[PDB]
Amino acid sequence: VVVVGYGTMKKSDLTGAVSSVGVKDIKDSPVANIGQAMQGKVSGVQIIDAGKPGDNVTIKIRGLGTINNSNPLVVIDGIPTDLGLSSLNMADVERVDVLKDASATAIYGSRGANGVVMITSKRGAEGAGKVTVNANWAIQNATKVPDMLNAAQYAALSNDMLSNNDDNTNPYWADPSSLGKGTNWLDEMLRTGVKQSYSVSYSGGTEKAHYYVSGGFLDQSGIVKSVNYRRFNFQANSDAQVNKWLKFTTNLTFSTDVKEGGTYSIGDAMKALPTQPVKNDDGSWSGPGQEAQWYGSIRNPIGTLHMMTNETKGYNFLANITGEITFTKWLKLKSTFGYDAKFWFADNFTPAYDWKPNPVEESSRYKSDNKSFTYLWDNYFVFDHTFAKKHRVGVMAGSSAQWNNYDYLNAQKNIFMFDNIHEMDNGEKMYSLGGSQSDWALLSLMARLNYSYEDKYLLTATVRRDGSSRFGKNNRWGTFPSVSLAWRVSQMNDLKLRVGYGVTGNQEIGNYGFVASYNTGVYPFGNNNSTALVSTTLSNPNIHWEEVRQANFGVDMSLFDSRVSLSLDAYIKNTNDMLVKASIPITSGFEDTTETFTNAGKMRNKGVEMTLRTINLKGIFSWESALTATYNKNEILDLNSETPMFINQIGNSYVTMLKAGYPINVFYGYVTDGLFQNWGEVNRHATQPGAAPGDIRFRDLNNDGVINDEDRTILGNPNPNWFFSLSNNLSYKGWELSVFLQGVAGNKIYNANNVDNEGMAAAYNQTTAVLNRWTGEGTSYSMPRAIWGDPNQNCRVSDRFVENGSYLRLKNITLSYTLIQLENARISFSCENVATITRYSGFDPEVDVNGIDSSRYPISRTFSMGLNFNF
Amino acid sequence: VVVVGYGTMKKSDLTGAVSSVGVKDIKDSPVANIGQAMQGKVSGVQIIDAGKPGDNVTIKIRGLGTINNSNPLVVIDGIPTDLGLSSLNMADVERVDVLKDASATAIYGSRGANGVVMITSKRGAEGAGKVTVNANWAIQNATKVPDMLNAAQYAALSNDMLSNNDDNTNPYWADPSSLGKGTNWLDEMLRTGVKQSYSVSYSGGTEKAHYYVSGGFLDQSGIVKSVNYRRFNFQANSDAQVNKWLKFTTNLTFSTDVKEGGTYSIGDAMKALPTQPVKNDDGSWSGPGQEAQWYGSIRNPIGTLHMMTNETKGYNFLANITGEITFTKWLKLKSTFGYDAKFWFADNFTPAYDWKPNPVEESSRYKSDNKSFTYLWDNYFVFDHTFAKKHRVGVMAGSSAQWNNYDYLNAQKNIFMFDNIHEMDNGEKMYSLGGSQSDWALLSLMARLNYSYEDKYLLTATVRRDGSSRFGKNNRWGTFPSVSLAWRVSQMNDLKLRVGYGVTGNQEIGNYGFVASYNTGVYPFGNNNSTALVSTTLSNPNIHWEEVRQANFGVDMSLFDSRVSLSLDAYIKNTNDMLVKASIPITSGFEDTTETFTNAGKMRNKGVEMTLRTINLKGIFSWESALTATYNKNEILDLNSETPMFINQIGNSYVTMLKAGYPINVFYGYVTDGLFQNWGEVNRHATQPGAAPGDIRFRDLNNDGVINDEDRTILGNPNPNWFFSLSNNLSYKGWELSVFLQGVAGNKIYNANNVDNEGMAAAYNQTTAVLNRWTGEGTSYSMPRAIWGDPNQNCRVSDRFVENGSYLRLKNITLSYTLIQLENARISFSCENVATITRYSGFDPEVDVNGIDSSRYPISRTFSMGLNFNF
C-alpha cells in the first residue's frame, strides 16, 4: 500500500501519479543521507548533489514552477516539518513516496504546489523479536582535478604579459627554465576522506502491541584538509490496542550533529601562484611580495585553513502522538498531535596574525544561538461502507491547525589577549549584538470523497479551504477544489486509464509581507527636535497565494502474460498570480525604486514521463531491469513588464536574463567570431574600442557598424530536456550484482571559473589551456593573446565560456554475497561514480539550477565495503 | 521490595536503615511537587517548604553534617542527576526510598555522605489495558498577615519621634485624627491564587513486554499579584524480552516550564507609609515627597510590580537505556547508558519611568542562555547461587563513569526608543557581555557481597574505589569500605537486631579548586611595557574529599499477634577532613587574607529515631495510626583555629557565630535587662554611650563596669531537638477520612523583620506593637521610647528579637467518597494548613536552616477538590 495523506490507499486503486521507493533500493547505498540515495531512481524528479558533508541536495519536481522558492514539501510521519534530510538515519526508513500531479497534492491545499515528499519509518512486525546490526566503512577521493601551470610556465606567461603591455618584468624571472616546478596548492589542500557508520536496533510484535527501537552513529571526514561531521540518532516507535474501541500510536525522534571546518576557498587555491613556497625557512607561513603586479594579493589558504576554526552544533526533537476512537463498525475518529523543537549554536574564532598582504591585528570570537518550535493538531472523521455489495463510499472530513515561533541572538568580542585562553570573559571590547523574532499561523478545513462501482469506475473528489496569517486582510481565505477519474478497459492482460485535474497553491511568500517599513527621522522645532516616522514601501493588503492549475493523463499497461509493465504520463501545468515587480505611480507619493510585489506573473510547463520494467530471465539466474525516461519543456508567458530582468551578476555584468516567450535563466551575451591577424582586418571591421591584433572579434548582430550593448542574444538554455536512467540486477546462488546508470542531456553550463583562470589580465595562476595562446600571426585561431588589463574586454559575457552539459555516468556497482548462532549474514562491496562520459572541462558537470559554476565543493568517488548481521 | 542501588532487596532482608513511601500516601495531596508531599512522612529527614511556585524544598538528613553544602543526592531511575524535584510529575511516581545509614549509602562512595533519595517511576502491569484520568482544582490564601499602623497612628508616632529628637515636624500633621485611615499595601499586594491540574495516562502488560505512557499539565498562580507558573510533562516507559538470553529496558522523560513575575519585595511593602495614595489624581503612580525625614525614600512597589516583567523558560530531557545478557542460570551481565540535557533562558525588561525617589531614564533588556549535558555508563556482573540448600551467596562487581559539561552567555542593551517595540535590534548601546565554561569527570570501581545462613544470620560487605578530577594530584583515588551484620532472635512474635558500620565521603568542593588565580600586570622597561602574571591564592594540590564515619544500631519488633510494629534506631556520626580556613605563613610570600582551604575540621552528630504503627479496629470500621518521633543533637569539635567565625551579617553586625564545643549557627549577642525610669538609675548604672531615660538597659556579663563588645553570650540554638508526627485513617463503606499531624519543637527563631519595623528610628511604617511604647515614667517596662537615629543603639543584636520556634500544625484533612461505562470513580476534598498553634509573631514559623526570617514568601492555605476516573 501507499500513503496519500490522511490515510492509505492501494496502488491498483490510485487515480493519480504516485511514485514510491522500496526497501530493496535503499539497502546498500554508501551515501550518507537519504537524498543522495534516490538520485535518478524516480521519474519526474531532479536531484542535484552538493558534496560537502552535512549538506542537503536540491529537489525539483517536474521543472521549475516560479522564479521564487520552488522547493517541495517534506512530510515526516504525517508531520509537515522543515527538518533537513541529512538529519535522518537511512537505516530505519521504510519507504519514500512522492506526489506529483495536482490530483493527489490538492489535499494539502496552499502548500502542495511544488510536490509533496512522504517519508515513512519502520515499525515492528508480529512474531519473535529480531536484532539487526549494520556496519560500513568507506574512503573518498576527488574525481577530476584541473591542471595548472608550473613555476616556469607561469614565469613565461607573466613575462609575455608584461612585455605586451610595455611594463617592467621581474628582474630574476628572465630565465624561467631555472625556476623548476614549484608548489601545487590543489594537491596539498585535498586529502583522502574516511567514512564509517554503525547501527543497531531491535523490534518485536504482538497481535495487540508493537514496538521498535533504533540507534546509529556516523562519522565522516571531507576530502579537503579540515572538515569533520558527526551524527547521533535515536528513535522509538510504539503502537498499542488498549481495548476494542481505543488505540494509540507514538513516534519519537532525537538527533544531534556536530560540524567543523576552517576558512577555505577553492577559487583562492586555484589562483595561488606556484612560485610561492608554503612556509618560510623559519617555519612561518609565507605570503605575496610587496609588488602586487608580480606576486598578487592572495592570502595564504593553508594558513587560514589551519589557523581559523568554525564550529556548529544542533539538537532536534520530534514527537507524534495519535489516537483513534471506534464508534461503530463503519465510523472512526482520529486525533493527532505533533511537536517539533530545534536548536542551533555557532562558534567562530579568528586568531590575530600578521599576514603579508593584509595583516590581522584583532582576534575576535563570534557566537550565535537559534530556537524554533512548531505545533500541530489534526482532527478528522473516517467513513467507509458498502452499499448493495457493489457501491463503496469513503468520506473523510476534518480540520487542522499549525503555528511556529522563532528567535535568535548573536554577539562578538575582541582582543582576548592570550590566544589559548579565549573565553568570553577575557575580552573587554564589545563589537556587535542583535536579535529578532518571527512567527506565523495557519488554519484549514478538509473534505475528501471516494467512490467505487464494481471495480470498473473510480471517482474521487477533494475540496479544501485554507487560511493563513501571511495573506492580506482582503484575501484571508481560499478554496482549492479537485476531481479525478479512472476506469479499467479489461473489465495485453491489463489496461487502465487515469484522468485528473485540480488546483493548488503556494504560500512561500515570507512573513509580514503586508506591512510597510518606516525609518526614524526628526523634524526641527523652534528649539527642540521631535522624532518622526517616514513611510516607505507602501503596504500591500492584497497579497495572496499563487494559483497553479494542472491537468494529467495516465495509461497503465501490462504485456506478455503480466511479465513487463508500462506507464505513460502527460501533464500540462500552468502558473498564475506569480509575484513580480510592481509599478508605483508618481501620484502615489512614492518612487519606482521601492521593492513592492504583486501577483501578476504567469508560467507554463509541460512534458511526458515514462517508466518500463522487465523481468525476463528466470530459474537459477534472475535478471531484472528498469528503464526510466522523462521529457520536459519550460516557457514564460508574462511578467507584467516591458523590459527584461537581469540577475546573477558575474564579474561586472549580468549573465542570466528573464524575458517573456523564452525559458527561465537563459544566458544573454555577445557572440565571438574569431581572432584578428593583422591591422588590415582590424581597420576594415566594425569599430571596437581597444582593438589590436590577436584579440577576439565579435559579430555585429545589427547592421549598424558599431559593436555595442545591442549586439547580444541568447546563448543557451541551462534547463535540460531529457532525463534517463537504467538499472540491472542479477542473482545466482546468493551472489547478486547490480549496475545502475544515470545521465542528463540537453543543457548548457557557464564556466565562471575560467573568467579569471583564462583572462590572463591579472596576477592569477592560469590553466594548461593558455600554453597554445596567440604569440604571432597564424600561431593560433582560438586562444587570444596575453595582455595586462585586457583593453579589448576579451573576458566579457559571450559564448566563449559556454560548454555542453550533457553527460552519462556510471552511478553504482554493488556486489554482495550471502553467507556461533546466527540467522543471516552478508558482505557487500560497492562503488560510487566509477566513470563519467562528458565533454565538460571542470571539476564535475553537476552544477546548480541556473548552470553557474564558481568555486563549488568537489564531488568525490567512494569505495566501500559493508556488513550485516541478524540474530 | 525496595531498591538499594544496583539491584533490589526485600524489606525483611535489609541489614540497614531504609525508609520508603508508598502510593497510598501520595494519592490525594493538593501540593504541586513531590517534595512538599513527603514532609513529616519519614523519620530522620527534615523538610522545609518555600512557598513560591516553581521552587524546591530544602532536605536535610539526620542533621547538618558540615558547614558547607550538605544537600543529599537525588537518583532518578538509577541516574544520579541534579534535576529539581519541582520538574517531576507526581501522578506517575511509584515510590520514594531514602537511605540514611552509612551501611547502605557506602555503595555510592564519594557522594553518599549526606543521604541518597531514590525515586522510582510507574511501569505497566500484566493484563488488560488501563486508562487513568485525574483532575484537581484548588485555591490559595495567606495564613497570617501582620498588622500595621494606620495614617493617624503613624502621624502620631512620627510627631513623637521628631519631638523627642528636637526636630521640626510636619506642618499639616499636627492633627493626626483628621488624617483618617490611609492605604494598606499588604492587602493590595496579595490576592487569592488559583491552581488547576490535569493528567491522563494509559498502560498495558504482557508476559514478554510492557509499556506505559503518561502526560500532564499544571497551571498555578501565586498569592501575590503577578506570579504565574506552567508545566508540561511527558514520559514513556518500555520493557521487552527479545529472546531467552536478551532483555532491554527504556525510560524517556520530557518536561518544560515557564515562570513569570514582576519586581517585588515584602520588606518594601511592609515599610511603605500608609499616608501615600496608590495613584495620583491623574492616574500616574505616586511617590515619596521631597523631605526624606517625613516621607522616606521607598519606591512604589505596585508600580514596579506592574511595570517590570521577568520571564524564564526551561527544557529538560532524560533518557535511560538498559540491557541484560543471561549467560548461565546463575550468572547475568547488565549494561546501562544514561543521558541528560538541560536548557535555560531568561528575559528581563525594565521600562524607563520617572520615579519620584530615584527616576529611571534608561530602559534596558537582559537575556541569558544556559546549557548542561551529563552522561553515564555502568557495567557490572550479577551472581546468585545456593550452596548445600542452606548457604546463599550474592556477588556484584563492576565499574562506572560519568562526566558533565556546562556553558552560559548573557548580554544587555539600552535606550530601545519605543517601549512597545523592544527587540534587540532596536537598541544601539551595548552594556555587557560575558560567558564561561566548566566540566568535571569521575571514575569508580564497585564490589558487593551478600551472604545468608539458614535465614538466621545475614552478612553484607561492600568496598568501592573512587577517583574524581576535582581532587588534587596527590589524592586522586580513595577507598570506602563497609560492613554490616543482622540476625533474628525468634529463629512478641518476631525480633531482629541490626548492626552496621561504614565510611563514606563527600566531594561537593567545587571545580578547579587546586588551581591558583592570577591577575594581569605590567612591568615598565626602558621604553616598553611587558605584561606579567602575579600569583595569588597559592595552589593546594592536597585537596581531597571529606571523610564521614557512622555506626548504627537497629531493633525490629512485632507485638500483639503481629498487629503493631516497632522500630528503634540509634546512630553516631563523625565528620573528618572538613574544609576550613587555612593559615598562610609569612615566609610563604603570601598574606593571611588569601582564601585558601584545607581538610582540618571535625563535627559529631548523634540521635535516636523511632517508628510505631498500629492497626487495631477491624470489621466495618477500619482504624489505622502511625507515630513517628526523632531526637538529634549536634556538636562541633574542632575548627583548626583559635578565634570564632562570624557570619550572616544583619544590619551592621554579625548574628551567627561558630565555635568549638557548641552547636552550629548559634546566636551571639547582648542581654537586655530592662528600661531606664529616671536619671538616677542611669547615673548609678554601668557606663553606656547615648544613655537616656526610657532606653534599654543591658547587663554587664563581666565585672568591669563598662558595657562593650565583651558583654556578649549565646542566645539560642536554631537547630531543633524533637521531630514528631501523627497520622490517622478511617474507612467505612467507601467513605474514608484521614487526619495528619506534624510539629517541631526545641528551636529559636531570630526575627530580622522587626529590626526595622520596631526600631522607630527611621521613616518606616511600624507594627501595632509600638502603640504601648514608653511615653513617660511607669508607662511601660518592655517597649522603649521613640527616638530618631537611635543614639543608644536599642536595635542592636540581643535577645530582644529572639522568639520561640516550637509549633504544632494540623497539616492535612482529606475526605473522599467512592462512587456510561466506568470501573472506578472517586471524589476527594482536602485541606492544607488548616490551623497552627505557636507563640511566634510573624508570617509563619517555617524559616530557613539558620533561623533567620527576612522578607520571605508567605506560606498559603489551600482548599482543593479532586476527581479520579478509571476506564
Short mmCIF file of N, CA and C in Angstrom, two decimals, chain A residues 12 16 18 40 109 212 438 731 748 770 857:
data_model
loop_
_atom_site.label_atom_id
_atom_site.label_comp_id
_atom_site.label_asym_id
_atom_site.label_seq_id
_atom_site.Cartn_x
_atom_site.Cartn_y
_atom_site.Cartn_z
N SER A 12 -3.18 -0.24 -6.88
CA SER A 12 -4.07 -0.53 -8.00
C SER A 12 -5.27 0.41 -8.04
N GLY A 16 -4.14 8.83 -9.48
CA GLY A 16 -3.20 9.87 -9.83
C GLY A 16 -1.79 9.35 -10.07
N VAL A 18 1.52 8.65 -8.61
CA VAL A 18 2.21 8.43 -7.35
C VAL A 18 3.37 7.47 -7.60
N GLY A 40 17.86 9.77 -9.44
CA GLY A 40 17.59 9.03 -10.66
C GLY A 40 16.75 7.78 -10.48
N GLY A 109 -3.62 21.60 -0.12
CA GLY A 109 -4.09 22.94 -0.41
C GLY A 109 -3.02 23.96 -0.73
N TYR A 212 9.46 -0.72 18.42
CA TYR A 212 10.64 -0.65 17.57
C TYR A 212 11.56 0.43 18.13
N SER A 438 10.12 35.99 15.00
CA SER A 438 9.13 35.83 13.94
C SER A 438 8.20 34.68 14.29
N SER A 731 21.15 -12.40 -9.97
CA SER A 731 21.16 -13.21 -8.75
C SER A 731 21.39 -14.66 -9.12
N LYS A 748 23.19 23.52 -21.13
CA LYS A 748 24.46 24.22 -21.24
C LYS A 748 24.92 24.69 -19.86
N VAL A 770 46.31 27.78 -21.64
CA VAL A 770 46.92 29.02 -22.11
C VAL A 770 48.27 28.79 -22.79
N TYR A 857 32.17 22.86 -4.04
CA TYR A 857 32.82 21.74 -3.37
C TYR A 857 32.91 20.55 -4.32
#
